[model samples]
Target: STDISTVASPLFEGTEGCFLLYDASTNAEIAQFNKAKCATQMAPDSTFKIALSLMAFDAEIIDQKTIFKWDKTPKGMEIWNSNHTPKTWMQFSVVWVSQEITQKIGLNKIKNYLKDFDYGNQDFSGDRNNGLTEAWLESSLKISPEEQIQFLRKIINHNLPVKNSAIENTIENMYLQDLDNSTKLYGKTGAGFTANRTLQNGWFEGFIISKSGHKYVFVSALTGNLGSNLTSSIKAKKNAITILNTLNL
Candidate 1:
């Protein structure tokens, strides 16, 4: 369990957001701080790709061995050279895989699947209250830290209505890195802007498959007014690892 009151003013400082930690097994609130509305619903950036990729797998749209050509295109606000191409789907970069996968499945199908999931305040066919940019469809994916944690919990518990094998495969393929070698933890990371400001929202969402047959899934988000700050994403991840380590999960 986490202590919300333990976070001091100095710790939160200029950051404006909410955080939650709950037991994936029991759905019990482990730790939380801040009001629910403190966070806005905006594009989940690349994180939405996890859901999209899962949809692709669930529909038998792709498999672990499916490969696409690497068509490295400009990524991020900076449009920096990523040197990644769609053909490089097997390269261990979730973002690259996500983009290419979405394009292949077609938005109409993706939209239908999203509705089936009922992920939150996002509806592809709904009204355009949320702004639309060239990247709107991709960036319009939104979820709060609380919702993110809950979503992961649902997957870990098999509460989602999707097929079990599809869920398992999706989780296996979505992992962005190889940490927690002892338990086989898998996850995805998303970094993008918010409020038309340079501030970025860094996300780490996934689960830990323990040797004892326990599954611990979690999502951690760090939001700040520093999009260029390379540390924002790491800070979010570090905070999550600290919490997981505290529970020794």
Candidate 2:
């Protein structure tokens, strides 16, 4: 296996993180760093939307064309206050959209789907009455960087129990941008505190379609102290982009 620790180390400076790259065509791992962190599960945070999107779409609770008119409620981020489509929801990682979808899907159904998808710890018992919406948001739900690579492989290969449309559309929602022609990038960014709720954790994970038409699934997660009050997911996303761009994969 190739080790990309040197290439990815500087980007994760001041933070502890793990990066796992898997070769889809070969069905094998190509490179990984910080094996321990990759194996250790942390709160999935916004990354859980990858699975939630599949469930919501599979249940027909939401679709690619679904447009959620913003309620004009002041959210923490400005991008979140405007109208959002499923694509924009994924792009901005909208919290209200996720909650509305989950509320429609119901907690019982969501739990069963989580078990079927084998996602994280499948624990949604969070915030007492707000369990459904709050579980994956730095609460009970957790998934490791290693497990993220596996889960993404499932989505890439259409191995999940959901219909092919769910797989297809959810993948479409994950689209971030094109690194260039023949190289399309897709991923989800997540940020939250660790299990102990101390250091902040950042995650950038998803699949990539290379110019050769081969697919690669990967996960990059970082953990560090953050009194400076910056968002970890943005930093993680930026660094992940830099590394992937440099690799030219």
- TM-score, per-candidate, Cα-based: 0.76, 0.94
Those runs of model 1 whose alpha carbons end farther than 4 Å from true positions after fitting are: 4-14, 35-40, 72-96, 125-138, 175-184
> What is the lDDT, from 0 to 100, of the residue 98 in candidate 2?
89
TM-score of 2: 0.94
For 1-249, candidate 1 gives per-residue lDDT tens digits of: 565535522344465545556678988766655545325455566556556656767777676666554456555423323443222332234454565566666667766666666565655432253322223233556767667677778776767777776677767665544345455556666666664577777766677666676776666666777546645556556665555555555
Clashes of each: 11, 0
User: Candidate 2, residue 220: CA error in Å?
Assistant: 0.9
Worst 10 residues of 1 by lDDT: 129-138
Clashing pairs in 2: none
Q: What are the per-model C-alpha RMSD values against the true structure? A: 4.4, 1.6
